[PDB]
Amino acid sequence: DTKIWNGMVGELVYGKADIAIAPLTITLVREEVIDFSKPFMSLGISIMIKKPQKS
Amino acid sequence: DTKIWNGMVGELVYGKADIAIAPLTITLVREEVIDFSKPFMSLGISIMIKKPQKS
């Protein structure tokens, strides 16, 4: 409704913080508001299962 | 010696080509000469071995 970025984006868009050296997903809706650098960490959704010990 | 970029970089640095929609590794020595976009393809060195041919 109010279209207010909260969080670390709200500290960069609204001038509160100077830079965010933090784990932040580069999205398109966050691309237009702040300048991301290149991705330092390629990642994605992974499958956490229990390691097996069963019998 | 002559510090001349060949290849597709030499077509972008020396104005011959307009854009390179091509598989090109984003390196630092290529970052300073041309503007890369964000990486569309996370990749790296992989281990190609023969499939087990248990016959």
Query: Which of A26, A31, A38 should be substituted to probe chain B, the one whose Cβ sees the most B Cβ atoms within 10 Å?
Result: A38
Nearest Cα neighbor of B20 from B29, B28, B11 is B11
Token output for B45: 């060195």
Question: Under DSSP, is residue B42 helix (H, G, I), strand (E, B) or coil?
Answer: coil
Q: Is A32 left (phi over 0), alpha (psi -120 to 50) or beta?
A: alpha
Distance, CA of A27 to CA of A16 (rounded, Å): 21
Residue B39 at interface with chain A, using a CB cutoff of 8 Å: yes
Rg (CA), chain B: 17
Instruction: Look up residue A37 and give its DSSP letter.
Output: -
Token output for A36: 């991301």
Method by which the model was determined:
cryo-EM
Instruction: Look up residue B50 and give its DSSP letter.
Output: P
Question: Under DSSP, is residue A10 helix (H, G, I), strand (E, B) or coil?
Answer: helix
Query: For residue B26, which phi and psi values (nearest 5 degrees)?
Result: -75, 105
DSSP secondary structure, A12-24, as one string: HHTSS-S---S--
Distance, CA of B28 to CA of B10 (rounded, Å): 16
Residue A46 at interface with chain B, using a CB cutoff of 8 Å: no
Nearest CA in chain A to B42: A42
